[PDB]
Design a protein around this ligand. Structure first.
Ligand SMILES: NC(=O)c1ccc[n+]([C@@H]2O[C@H](COP(=O)([O-])OP(=O)(O)OC[C@H]3O[C@@H](n4cnc5c(N)ncnc54)[C@H](O)[C@@H]3O)[C@@H](O)[C@H]2O)c1
Ligand SMILES: NC(=O)c1ccc[n+]([C@@H]2O[C@H](COP(=O)([O-])OP(=O)(O)OC[C@H]3O[C@@H](n4cnc5c(N)ncnc54)[C@H](O)[C@@H]3O)[C@@H](O)[C@H]2O)c1
Ligand SMILES: NC(=O)c1ccc[n+]([C@@H]2O[C@H](COP(=O)([O-])OP(=O)(O)OC[C@H]3O[C@@H](n4cnc5c(N)ncnc54)[C@H](O)[C@@H]3O)[C@@H](O)[C@H]2O)c1
Ligand SMILES: NC(=O)c1ccc[n+]([C@@H]2O[C@H](COP(=O)([O-])OP(=O)(O)OC[C@H]3O[C@@H](n4cnc5c(N)ncnc54)[C@H](O)[C@@H]3O)[C@@H](O)[C@H]2O)c1
Ligand SMILES: NC(=O)c1ccc[n+]([C@@H]2O[C@H](COP(=O)([O-])OP(=O)(O)OC[C@H]3O[C@@H](n4cnc5c(N)ncnc54)[C@H](O)[C@@H]3O)[C@@H](O)[C@H]2O)c1
Lengths: 337, 368, 368, 368, 337
């Protein structure tokens, strides 16, 4: 019921789309996308996926802009100018970019004045960016605040429980890093780009980096700043990615003690947010998995009850979208205006 | 020697340079490359290759734009326009398309407008005007005053050409087709993002590319006898760089064994195409073919005949080396010839040169 | 309904089991798994797949030995000798060969000796008598309880089945040649290390391998109508499960188009090769044919008519899961006509029909 | 109406023009040529033919470069360089070649890079990849967006192919030869002078200039069905403008007579080559075919057959006029296949025009 | 002169070979191998590598067992049983457990029993193993010791500098983890295996595990024991791998101080052994670089100057045998018998 538009039909697009359809009783009148992508092309890109295979559903871009999916048409156009986008044509409620270029506040506006009302981007935006994610800062969502974004999946991944950890045990300091999947952030081969690594081919390598996550932690958190920081590794995955972390925690303990804490934390608040297991598993074993990540409690070893290595997958794509839907839902629900 | 540069900067250009550099006796004066990224991005990338790794030399980046190789001081211009490219500003005659987008003589012309004389294409350029080129095959057809704006076809093409020319003219194809192990290439969207098509969009990291190329038709573009008789898609597949092909075709020959073809290949290898292409007999696999000095490298075993006509012929190549190895030779064949022309002294064609200059001579026009 | 083991945990049998459990009313009474790893190792893969991922439901690991797939009690065992397979004990009916080794009749038959009834393997015919067997082509022929030692050849082979029956029957081929995108195969090793031979002796993980394969023979060993007329080579490629073949063939029928053949395919897809053969018409990529149901699937486009008689045609198939379906198919294909009959209702005053039991009668003294 | 173009005012030019202007509703026209003629001359040069005489409409000489063709304002330039051709500088789409010097796509893409889409030469160029084109022969075979610049081979051939492309097609030649007349053209020498060539150097004014031509094979260059099946002789005879080809052909059609084939040609004229091939009945000679828009002009009676097998066929054709009538219409197929005809093709399903515009980044068609 | 032999001619073999060959001036009289791998196969293995490419060196299998490397013949047969393995044929100087299977103390000795004197297991030995390696115990090694081992390349990688780091700084606690490749250590496809992970195909996954490196530190580092441990990640690479390390340390400083410390470490010890830089280059860019490990000096961010995330590369294949080749000549050196 919430007229949200999707500029930049990024992988999250079909993801959220498949999510939107995978989600039940949509609070979201998302009848509109936007991307240079070909109407049918996008449809196939929706109708078929390297990750999920084909879309087990109906794909038939109604006319051109609209796309008949399970009867539900959905608009989309091939444009890059925000103000060109027909946000007004439906009087769009929320901005959803995927170009990965609207880290700004302005395009959001350049989307807003074109007929949009709310604003969230997947990646942690740069600037006056309202950090928002489930369990952590999503509660701050009111209708006055409109021009926000989302944290990274990576960010979203660690987000709640690490705080809950600092809540449950207190964290002196902490250092994390992902096994991130390769993305559009890297040209398939080492072609010119800002970051030579991000430029680098690395389709068979790792990306030593540090996403805004290692700082967006501070962003999403009230106090958990600086002391808690690591780096990022976009690594040879096409799929759901894992993320490492060792924490220097306050409370003295052993692992499962905190993993039980993780366990007891898993149900109540991390319901559909995170998970934790110990069956010896690997990457693919969590494709399209609802929650943001599972934890290998066994391999979350501890050193001297402060230094605590931790394990964490994350559905870089889908659970992100899941969370993105969740955040969207949180905004979709309690829709003051 | 002759001022050489590279419009845009493709992977090829890196290794090409890395060849042009390894390249020993360059009559080619590479001084600049249109890398839209500065001396940094143009030094780092080209220095370390996905395959060749960090080069065995110096990437000194001079003047935040220039760059020297242990003493090969070379500028790096940065502009997505052809017209603002120091060819006249730097006497560049021979140039190299790196964008792949300038399949048009116009862009090259724009380079010619920018003072270029000669440019190549990292593809079979869709401007049919310029005859393509490939060493060991139609490089001999390259003369002077022919397509100052110059073209060559695709590595894929530029691989199969000689022997597929050779074997037929040694055996005789009526028609037939081929695929290859073409690689995942940045021209494809490494993950599923629109490219006006699905194929290159789909995650090449996990799929073959169902797609027709031009090789199956750019073939005859140098060998007329092959007119139309070839088709059938090559295959771009999850390889880093490897590009190996086999083509089966009919015959008009007597239907000899699948042996006395590699023989002819060995002959073709030995006689006309020594070092040009290659042929092996050890059963080898993708990566081993690496920096191969041969547009064509072929097994004898996998060759197979059934009823004389049908003849599958294993073949391998690397785009980079191949395309390089060609352009490694191309500009030379250009250099040794067009700059420093020094034409003949046979009066029988003295005026024909003036006719080659002005074919509307007092008497040159022939057959209308 | 009919006792079904797992002779070593066949990954093929895995999905085939996943097929079976995903199947509707399979008379294949899956009861036990000879996975040399216990209930632990023999459920982990049954719960999480490489290309499928986690199973939909739960195969609960009941006792240290013997489990269920969602309330479906299924045993486990750990052995490597058929003679050491308590199968008569479990009244086992059909060889469910996951060890992928006993292409021999006897060792396989030993399972029949162990109490099984009919052999089934993912096996190309080591010997000959073993009926090269596939649905769609050579299935109706299967004699009830006749020649219990049967199996199916390589994926590619049973993949080849429909069209290699269709094209000929619809067009008539003199000869021809295929080649398929062959995923890396577990039996072939991961890296450059110890190996039966040189071919698979490398890391096709990043490399690629063609090789001979009896398939062409096998499918001719299936369909002599083109015996010793077809060849080609599967292409080992870094894919988990990608398997799609081409085919180049000199045909007889006039150089008609492909759509006809594809409408023939349409008709053939309509025809008996329904569900195991698809006419592909939406441009899709390798993975897209994930978990697919068709031992053959042909894109409209790549169907190419090179020289009329020479015709190029792709074909897609899930090397494993489709085969697994096919595997599930052939079993059911037998399970229906299985020995559930009226138990020898015929009658003959033949003392043969009497001493058939008491063969040791110089009275009868069986011919031998 | 399209921004058609013509290289220079070659002796074919005004013919084309005066016939194009004579043409009723051509969607095609040039607004400017380029040659050092001077319009006032060029007009006269166009206006009062030595064969067609004065045009039946006065072209105002607006000025030394511009003019208005009886109200049709069209320009000319004066230059010999194909580079600085104001083609896009007047939005030129597709060009006609007049010099005859451009056997090369090289010289052509010049005009393309001058701002043109495609070009045509009224001559068999030496660009194999360039297919010549002729009505009833290769028009539908021609495809826009393929082989951008093309030409048409000799009017002779342009006249040749018509009948043979049915003649053998109904009759069936074994291997027959052609023989044609030829009116003195400027490429020859009127009063014996020195072309590098000996033949086209004597005083054509009187002596027959018997000269060979690829015509008898350039036919195959678009009619390979008779590749090598023909080689003949052209005969440059003292005619103002006129030509006729008498080709004898051994025919697998026993000793079929001619009139029947001529009736088939009567059919063929009444068939494919409407307005192109004519089959006549009247004793008629050089001028008696003047300015007929037919290309192939044949008299059944003047045709005949020697041995049933071999049979000769007289076929008339102007050099200049007919060429025009043919090439003028031959140009149309390009407009009939005009790129989108500039209308109604790209309803955002492409998103590719911008991809054509943003050539690289949104790597839609990054062919590789 | 070091009549050394190898059984189970594993990748390290050619590595060691291509090392030994490349390691000119060899007192190592390795003329004898054994492997299930075919005789001429072993050549092609060396003669054609997925890592170093086909060997740029003339190859010949001589008669048969002997293999003329660029002429230097080297015997090799096909067997597994130590007592079958006839090391006595040349009274072998040293055994190298290329097999990967006779991690035992006995079979090692059984090689000596069947004709040898010393043993260095390729892998972290099975318990009663004096592990020796550059930086840590190569000096502590005496030729008097016979059955020794080189622990994992990973171990071989990590040990010295981080030990020297502790020597430089004092490490309260430490947590590392490799970005290990995928290797024969794991099943290629979805096969059976001891551990579930390696049993998974996983060539497009990552293995959450822990190598003995996480403990062989204590096996080699006198002070550094127990407090200094993490896990292992065998990740989607076919090649040279990287590795993380976080360390709770004593010395209050920042990385750059430790960088120069790690810089001078190469200038003192890692010279030819390990490496470090900050030019952001991908794993491949570290191939065959004889310095067995590299460090991103930059991304080793500092947390409270005690918790210290650090980066680390390593040529899992080439530098490994190199270091083993190093110790091999160190065994050639002081070769008391
Ligand atoms: N998973 C994470 O936590 C993570 C990691 C990296 C980046 N990010 C950010 O989050 C997003 C990652 O998911 P995604 O699916 O959106 O990424 P993506 O790689 O799909 O983003 C590119 C998409 O934007 C579209 N696009 C680009 N330019 C466009 C234009 N001018 N007009 C229209 N469409 C255009 C492309 O067609 C494509 O669909 C990106 O925006 C990225 O910046 C977050
Ligand atoms: N590398 C080879 O040997 C080879 C062989 C045959 C064909 N090709 C194909 O041709 C294309 C180019 O060759 P490549 O493999 O090096 O690919 P590539 O992607 O490296 O080439 C394109 C490069 O040109 C640059 N570029 C594009 N437009 C530019 C502009 N206007 N100004 C300046 N720079 C510009 C891009 O940034 C990029 O670095 C690719 O699509 C490739 O697949 C390459
Ligand atoms: N999966 C396909 O598509 C396909 C197609 C054609 C042929 N094949 C061949 O047939 C085999 C079965 O196919 P798959 O999909 O099940 O892969 P797979 O991994 O299951 O095949 C190997 C299996 O055989 C078992 N095995 C071999 N020797 C054994 C022994 N002594 N004891 C116990 N188990 C033993 C292994 O445990 C393993 O489970 C394959 O290994 C392959 O070689 C497979
Ligand atoms: N007129 C015919 O009967 C006939 C027959 C066959 C072919 N053709 C075509 O026409 C060519 C010559 O015959 P024609 O009819 O054109 O007579 P032509 O002699 O007039 O053709 C040459 C004309 O092109 C111009 N020319 C030469 N070089 C030029 C240059 N660099 N730039 C601009 N103009 C240049 C000359 O002014 C000349 O008028 C032939 O080579 C062929 O291409 C004509
Ligand atoms: N380079 C590293 O990353 C690293 C790290 C630590 C240890 N290692 C050692 O090297 C190995 C990794 O490289 P690899 O290629 O040798 O791996 P691997 O585990 O496959 O080693 C086994 C090799 O030896 C042969 N082999 C094994 N058992 C044999 C037997 N009984 N008889 C004969 N031949 C036998 C095999 O054919 C194969 O070539 C490990 O197993 C370990 O021993 C290497």
């Amino acid at each position: 019921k919430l007229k949200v538009a999707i500029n930049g039909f990024g992988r999250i697009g079909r993801n959220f789309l498949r999510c939107w359809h995978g989600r039940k009783d949509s609070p979201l009148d998302v009848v509109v996308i936007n991307d240079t992508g070909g109407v049918k092309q996008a449809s196939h890109l929706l109708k078929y996926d390297s990750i999920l295979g084909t879309f087990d559903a109906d794909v038939k871009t109604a006319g051109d802009s609209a796309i008949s999916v399970d009867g539900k048409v959905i608009k989309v156009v091939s444009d890059r100018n925000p103000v060109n986008l027909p946000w007004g044509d439906m009087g769009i409620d929320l901005v959803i970019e995927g170009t990965g270029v609207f880290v700004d506040r302005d395009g959001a506006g350049k989307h807003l004045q074109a007929g949009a009302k709310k604003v969230l981007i997947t990646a942690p935006g740069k600037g006056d960016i309202p950090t928002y994610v489930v369990g952590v800062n999503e509660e701050g969502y009111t209708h006055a605040d409109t021009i926000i974004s989302n944290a990274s999946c990576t960010t979203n991944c660690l987000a709640p429980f690490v705080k809950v950890l600092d809540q449950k045990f207190g964290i002196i300091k902490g250092t994390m890093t992902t096994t991130h999947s390769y993305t559009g952030d890297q040209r398939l081969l080492d072609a010119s780009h800002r970051d030579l690594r991000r430029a680098r081919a690395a389709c068979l390598n790792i990306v030593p980096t540090s996403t805004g996550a290692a700082k967006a932690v501070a962003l999403v958190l009230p106090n958990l700043k600086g002391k808690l920081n690591g780096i990022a590794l976009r690594v040879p995955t096409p799929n759901v990615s894992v993320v490492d972390l060792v924490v220097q925690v306050s409370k003295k303990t052993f692992a499962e003690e905190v993993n039980a804490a993780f366990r007891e934390s898993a149900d109540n608040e991390l319901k559909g947010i995170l998970s934790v297991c110990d069956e010896p598993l690997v990457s693919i074993d969590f494709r399209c998995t609802d929650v943001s990540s599972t934890i290998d409690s066994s391999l979350t070893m501890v050193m001297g009850d402060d230094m605590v290595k931790v394990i964490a997958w994350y559905d870089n794509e889908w659970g992100y979208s899941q969370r993105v839907v969740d955040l969207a839902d949180i905004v979709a629900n309690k829709w003051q205006x | 020697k002759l001022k050489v540069a590279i419009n845009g900067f493709g992977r090829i250009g890196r290794n090409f340079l890395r060849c042009w550099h390894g390249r020993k006796d360059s009559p080619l004066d590479v001084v600049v490359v249109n890398d839209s990224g500065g001396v940094k991005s143009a030094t780092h990338l080209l220095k370390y290759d996905s395959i060749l790794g960090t080069f065995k030399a110096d990437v000194k980046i001079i003047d935040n734009e220039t760059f020297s190789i242990d003493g090969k001081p070379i500028k790096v211009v940065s502009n997505r326009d052809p017209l603002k490219l120091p060819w006249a500003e730097l006497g560049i005659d021979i140039v190299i398309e790196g964008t792949g987008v300038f399949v048009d003589g116009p862009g090259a012309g724009k380079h010619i407008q920018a003072g270029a004389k000669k440019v190549i294409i990292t593809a079979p350029a869709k401007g049919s005007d310029i005859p393509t080129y490939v060493v060991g095959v139609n490089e001999k057809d390259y003369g002077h005053d022919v397509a100052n704006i110059i073209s060559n076809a695709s590595c894929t093409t530029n691989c199969l050409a000689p022997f597929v020319k050779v074997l037929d003219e040694e055996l005789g194809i009526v028609k037939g087709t081929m695929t290859t192990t073409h690689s995942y290439t940045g021209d494809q969207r490494l993950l599923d993002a629109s490219h006006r098509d699905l194929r290159r969009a789909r995650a090449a990291a996990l799929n073959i590319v169902p797609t027709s190329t031009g090789a199956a038709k750019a073939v005859s573009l140098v060998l007329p006898q092959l007119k139309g008789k070839l088709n059938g898609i090559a295959l771009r597949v999850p390889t880093p760089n490897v590009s190996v092909v086999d083509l089966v075709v009919n015959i008009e020959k007597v239907g000899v064994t699948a042996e006395d073809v590699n023989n002819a290949f060995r002959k073709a290898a030995a006689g006309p195409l020594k070092g040009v292409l290659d042929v092996c007999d050890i059963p080898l696999v993708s990566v081993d073919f690496r920096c191969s000095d041969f547009s064509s490298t072929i097994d004898s075993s996998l060759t197979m005949v059934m009823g004389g006509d049908m003849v599958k012929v294993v073949a391998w190549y690397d785009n980079e080396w191949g395309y390089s190895q060609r352009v490694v030779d191309l500009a030379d064949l250009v250099a040794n010839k067009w700059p420093g022309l020094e034409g003949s002294v046979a009066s029988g064609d003295p005026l024909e040169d003036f006719c080659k200059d002005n074919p509307a001579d007092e008497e040159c026009k022939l057959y209308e």
